[PDB]
Amino acid sequence: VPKWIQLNNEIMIQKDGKFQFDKDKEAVHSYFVDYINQNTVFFHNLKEKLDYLVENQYYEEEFLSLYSFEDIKEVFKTAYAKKFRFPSFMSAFKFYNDYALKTNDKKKILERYEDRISIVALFFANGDTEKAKEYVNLMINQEYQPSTPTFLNAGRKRRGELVSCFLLEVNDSLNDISRAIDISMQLSKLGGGVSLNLSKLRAKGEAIKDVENATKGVVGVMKLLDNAFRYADQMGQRQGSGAAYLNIFHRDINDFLDTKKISADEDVRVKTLSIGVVIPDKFVELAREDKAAYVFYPHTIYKEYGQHMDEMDMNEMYDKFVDNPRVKKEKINPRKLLEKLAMLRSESGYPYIMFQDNVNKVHANNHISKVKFSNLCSEVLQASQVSSYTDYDEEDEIGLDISCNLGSLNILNVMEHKSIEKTVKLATDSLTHVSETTDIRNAPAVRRANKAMKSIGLGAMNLHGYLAQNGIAYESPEARDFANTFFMMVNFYSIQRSAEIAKEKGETFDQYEGSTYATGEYFDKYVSTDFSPKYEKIANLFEGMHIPTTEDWKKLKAFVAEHGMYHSYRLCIAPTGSISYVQSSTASVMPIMERIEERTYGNSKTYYPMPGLASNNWFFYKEAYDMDMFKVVDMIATIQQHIDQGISFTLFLKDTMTTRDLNRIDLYAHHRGIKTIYYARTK
């Protein structure tokens, strides 16, 4: 057992009835005195290091060639002047095991934290030394964290794509299904998580070229996609991850759900394909009134109306579908379906729940399309247009496939530096740069939507960490007040930066003129409701920072009207799995699952306390499972009212609560305006 691992395991050993949290710090020192410095490759000067990394195909020549060597050296010096120290052993371990650049033999460390941050900053700035230094100060203060793809791969020649969330629309044809399989394989090859909408696909027992009972339904397509994702597994590094979304009014919805049951046969169950269910308000109304619902055959609806079932508003179309004899449908019990969803989420955490009307009643780009499905993490909610992939030697009709750009603000570090505006604007600029530098040659609709929509996702993390280190309970009304104010400022500065980029470049996102930004509707609740903190403690937390008022929001609305907005979507709160360790932050805006988490690496045990955990804030670091899920829903809705896309919202349940409690949480989330529900993790 290594010395740093012993020093880390000494945390659980209680002295005077208290955990030895400070010992973790010592572990970090050991982890750097015994391992990191010994296995870190050192060079006589930075010029030699850069030459070795470029020549050995570690870095890219293009992004480094935009700067003189003096500017690169100045950026590296700015990164190293902070003298950044990892506060916990797990932060440094996760960085140097997951993100630090290693030799081809994986035994030496080529990149420190400052080196990786400097390289990512130089990639972000695209030739501006001052902008690169600003990015270096942003990331070394740990105010902003690029996502795992961006942080890991920026500036590296041997790399995947910087985007890892991809949403694909699948049209109801064999050509479109095969193209979707191909694109899923190509994007999993790039290292991205792929979500596919299967609602347009006709159900099982439908007609193919006017022969009856011929379609295999969406379950056969799910089997094909599951095989494709198993095959494309990042060159045998990570398990291929894919998601399939189906509307709850699709007839296959039960069989869809049956793919996640343990009792399902081998020809029914898909193991590497996550599933999500899109639930329109009509289904919730039918379940609430206990009226029996109807699941429709999509191809009959398409034949009758010329549009797909998921392309029209089910609230106004459901009665017409039911009363139409030419539309084929099957009787179901919506309450039984809700109970089945709750039971499946209890067993396996699936499916993801998308409340379609909750997403689309605040969606700014409904003119382009309504949000029909979400991503693999159930937080990307954007307009998508299906593509018509025709036969060979025939021109395809390329639509819009969602691929947003991830990046997370560290709420604790951002707010302690009183730099919400600067961090949000710099993160928006970096996300815009990464979106502009993304070029996928095997996903035509993804590339077209990246060029047109210019959608980015700016998330936040360390919400619970910040609240606990400031003596605020996550379920307290003060925490929701802080979340409201902080995320309203984040939205304000994100919109301001998007409008500034649109003014500078002279271009907005495609079909912006029809958006609620152009019409000013988006700013309605912002020009009438003041989002300043209602509690003195939160106001003192925001001291030293200008909180945008209704007049500021009116000025921003006028600015957007005059200049437009560059990004169709700006904010989405991703789970932030492993980057939260490196940043010493709690994951996403979720409450912490455990105060101290026990992990097993190799044959060794390691202990990670939550950041800033001590005896004084032990009570404020309440575990997520012990919390009331209604108050967690309230906080997530408070944040969601300022996020244009969704939030990865995992439910944290105890083994005691039943499926009725899960359904109640889901229905309260639907009532409170929650757009997506990610997971049902049972303790």
Binding site: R335, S346, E347, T658, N663, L667, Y668
Partner: protein
């Protein structure tokens, strides 16, 4: 007063070896000396033989002669565990760690090993001597079964536990701990049935039954000593294992309601370190807040 709680405990302990991935032991196995690997293979092979006969013969035959559908259900479940779960798990371990020829050789070795044949002869002989409606022959077989469950397995269990306690072969060790957890409750249960029969006897008859139990234990013990030396001398552990089997012999006697027979000794501390959701319907009030 006890069958229902044993039924519930047995069914809640249900497991399959496939639940435990074994490829993690590959390196700590590779690193053991040839002597250590040899002893380990042979030890598990001896265990496999015992479980084979406990599943094929011992548990089913006792089930046949014990009255009451619930008692029979417990004994049938225990029988299934012996041959469908326990005996099979050893093959999962063998197939992971060893090449086919070494596996073939160790199964040939069980057939020709005189101590393993003697202990099987003695235990199975008593099982097959049970006479219908003859409670004394049944008692004798139940004593034999308790001695198999709570004493005889332990010369074998020592070694996986000894490694588990050092952080070696921990996946195989996890399987063995599950097997041991099962045998402990099997030995208690059969012990309680044996005590039922013993308690029906005259004092004179009881005195003879204690003689039978102690004579049988000593005979099995003397054979187990030779078996232990044969397996463990090459790894230097025979004396330590002997202390362990004496410890467990006392537990077997206690399961039978008898006083401990061997004096207490310090056991190797390494070995001591080696040791759907509920559904409610949705009410109309759950849709309003």
């Amino acid at each position: 007063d006890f069958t229902q709680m044993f039924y519930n405990q047995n069914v809640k302990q249900f497991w399959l070896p496939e639940e435990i991935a074994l490829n993690g032991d590959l390196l700590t196995w590779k690193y053991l000396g040839k002597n250590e690997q040899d002893t380990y293979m042979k030890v598990l092979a001896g265990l496999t033989l015992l479980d084979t006969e406990q599943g094929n013969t011992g548990m089913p035959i006792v089930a046949e002669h014990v009255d009451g559908h619930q008692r029979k259900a417990v004994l049938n479940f225990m029988a299934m565990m012996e041959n469908a779960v326990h005996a099979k798990s050893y093959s999962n371990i063998f197939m992971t760690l060893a090449p086919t020829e070494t596996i073939n050789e160790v199964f040939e070795w069980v057939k020709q090993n005189k101590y393993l044949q003697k202990k099987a002869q003695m235990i199975v002989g008593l099982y097959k001597a049970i006479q219908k409606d003859d409670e004394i022959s049944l008692f004798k077989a139940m004593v034999a079964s308790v001695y198999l469950e709570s004493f005889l397995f332990y010369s074998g269990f020592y070694y996986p536990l000894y490694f588990y306690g050092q952080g070696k072969l921990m996946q195989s060790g996890e399987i063995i701990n599950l097997i041991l957890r099962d045998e402990a409750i099997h030995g208690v249960y059969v012990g309680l049935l044996a005590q039922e029969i013993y308690n029906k006897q005259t004092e004179e008859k009881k005195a003879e039954l204690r003689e039978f139990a102690i004579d049988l234990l000593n005979q099995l013990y003397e054979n187990e000593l030779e078996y232990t030396e044969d397996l463990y001398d090459q790894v230097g552990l025979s004396h330590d294992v002997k202390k362990f089997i004496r410890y467990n012999a006392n537990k077997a006697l206690m399961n039978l309601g008898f006083d401990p027979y061997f004096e207490e000794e310090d056991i190797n501390p390494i070995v001591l370190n080696g040791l759907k959701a509920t559904v409610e319907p949705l009410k109309d009030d759950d849709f309003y807040f």
